[PDB]
From a paper:
The signal recognition particle (SRP) is an efficient protein sorting system that directs the translocation of newly synthesized proteins from translating ribosomes to the endoplasmic reticulum (ER) or plasma membrane. Similarly, the eukaryotic SRP receptor (SR) consists of two proteins, SRα and the membrane-inserted SRβ, while in bacteria, a single protein, FtsY, is responsible for membrane association and interaction with the translocon. In FtsY, the NG domain (comprising of the N-terminal and GTP binding domains) is involved in binding a GTP molecule and forming a heterodimer with the NG domain of Ffh. The N domain of FtsYNG consists of a four-helix bundle (αN1−N4), while the G domain adopts a classical Ras GTPase fold in which five conserved motifs (G1−G5) are arranged around the nucleotide-binding site.
The structures show the N domain of one monomer packing against the G domain of the other copy in the asymmetric unit. Also an unique αβαβ domain to the SRP GTPase family named Insertion Box Domain (IBD) is present in the G domains and is involved in 4.5S RNA recognition and interaction with Ffh as previously reported.
Numbering used by the authors:
A (entry chain A): 195 to 497
B (entry chain B): 195 to 495
Write the structure that this text describes.
Amino acid sequence: GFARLKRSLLKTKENLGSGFISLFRGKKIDDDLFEELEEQLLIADVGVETTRKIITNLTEGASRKQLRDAEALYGLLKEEMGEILAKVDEPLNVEGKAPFVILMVGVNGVGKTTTIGKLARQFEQQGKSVMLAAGDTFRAAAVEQLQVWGQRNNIPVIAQHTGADSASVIFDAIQAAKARNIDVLIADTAGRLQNKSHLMEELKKIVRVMKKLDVEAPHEVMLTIDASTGQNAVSQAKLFHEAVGLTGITLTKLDGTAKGGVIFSVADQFGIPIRYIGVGERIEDLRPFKADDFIEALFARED
Amino acid sequence: GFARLKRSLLKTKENLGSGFISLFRGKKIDDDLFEELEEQLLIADVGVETTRKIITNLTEGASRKQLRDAEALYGLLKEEMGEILAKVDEPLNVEGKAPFVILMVGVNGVGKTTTIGKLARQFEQQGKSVMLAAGDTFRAAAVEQLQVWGQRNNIPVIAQHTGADSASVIFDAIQAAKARNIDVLIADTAGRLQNKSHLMEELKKIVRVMKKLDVEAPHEVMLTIDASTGQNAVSQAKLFHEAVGLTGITLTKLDGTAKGGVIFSVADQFGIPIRYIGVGERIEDLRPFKADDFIEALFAR
Ligand code: NA
Ligand code: NA
Ligand code: NA
Ligand code: NA
Ligand code: NA
Ligand code: NA
Ligand code: NA
Ligand code: NA
């Protein structure tokens, strides 16, 4: 089963999940084994803190259960790592708001930009009217590309002049969305690396200004991160979560990267729902995250 | 991949998957909508019982999620109908036995013999040593067809005179397979429905004789059914499963039939893994079943 996701995770499966099988084959459970396993988890971008927790729990379980052969660690790992992902399994529900406001945060990258477009198309296919807000106001090329995308897809895009106040653009977009019976408003934001404190103050202002129109907005603060960036995804998540407060995460570019193990670090460190994973180029390849599908694809050696 | 499968399933997609889109466009979620959906599922040969389950789960899911637009039902249907197939998505693994024994069952006229030969060639191309047993002992053309596959591919075929005892042929074949270090043995069987009890008793006798040589044999009891026969495929599956017990299914002739929806009835009613699907007449057109490829192709918009 899960052959499509198994293909997307092919390179990640070399080191994690089914990749553990060759590591444990024929070995005893001892300090040397756990050192080798720790190294492999770290090379897979699982992260120091999450790896330490896995090793601690696995070591105690193997000891208490008096396990003898390393092969048995495979099933215990599937349980421990599966629980990590199950704890952040909760799909995004955008129903019943006028509009449901998604504030899209994260650093500048193809992932964030592409995710806005894919989600907009998915919501339209679900029968919802969508509007976009071009809140990355100092990057004229990014604003124009969003306007181009909206025109190509007949989705309205609210934008102001280069250098406009992002909170004002997004406020105006919420007003336009309410006036035009929009179901979902997706608001882009700046994602510049220099002067991190400035960006975080900008995001806090955006959120405060929204409350004049709807105390429930933003209904979702969604971070987009790129699995191929390894631990940079974790540090980005920490930065945005501590500054604004995330309610959902989209993790892109899981297909074709050997760094897919970072999903475990994101899940364990922050406990924020992972709403979607990107595993391909099609609109439909931005999938709602299902922890059971993911762990089975990762650990099963059958196709 | 899913994209290649789209062409094979075009006819089925008129009523299922992407065929749902026009049904939901612009509509509200109400009893009339679910009645219209029920009609479309039934004409696609999804079956009365499976259709009712789909509608019930879709209704409960739409209520739970507080959906407003019928368009949003499309994704829930993809999820729920995909779950039906995911439950029978375990691939066949023929490794590690001496030999792994596949007992092929089913009625005459569904291509059991040709399916055996195609699988035998595939296993050989994968590097496995294969042997075939001509257990459809009263049908000389079936024995000859199996021998043709064996002769073309240098695969041994165990056979006796027309009218021989099928259990004896298969017993001798298992003994020969063990003596010759064979990896996979595939046994053809009789398929006359005119006397259902006689056929099922013959199959049970074959199985009893196998177990005297290896308690694990047969490792797979595989049914072949023809998707273009609609609910006949479902009734055939029920007969063999309740009488003998199936562990895998090969579903042929999915390409060009508007009755491909029967796969959901087979999956839901019996829960037996669907190991392979046929989307053409060639060896290469008998593909390992991948439920996610199938759903993605069916629902692609
Ligand atoms: Na970590
Ligand atoms: Na309000
Ligand atoms: Na209803
Ligand atoms: Na499968
Ligand atoms: Na062979
Ligand atoms: Na032949
Ligand atoms: Na051949
Ligand atoms: Na058996």
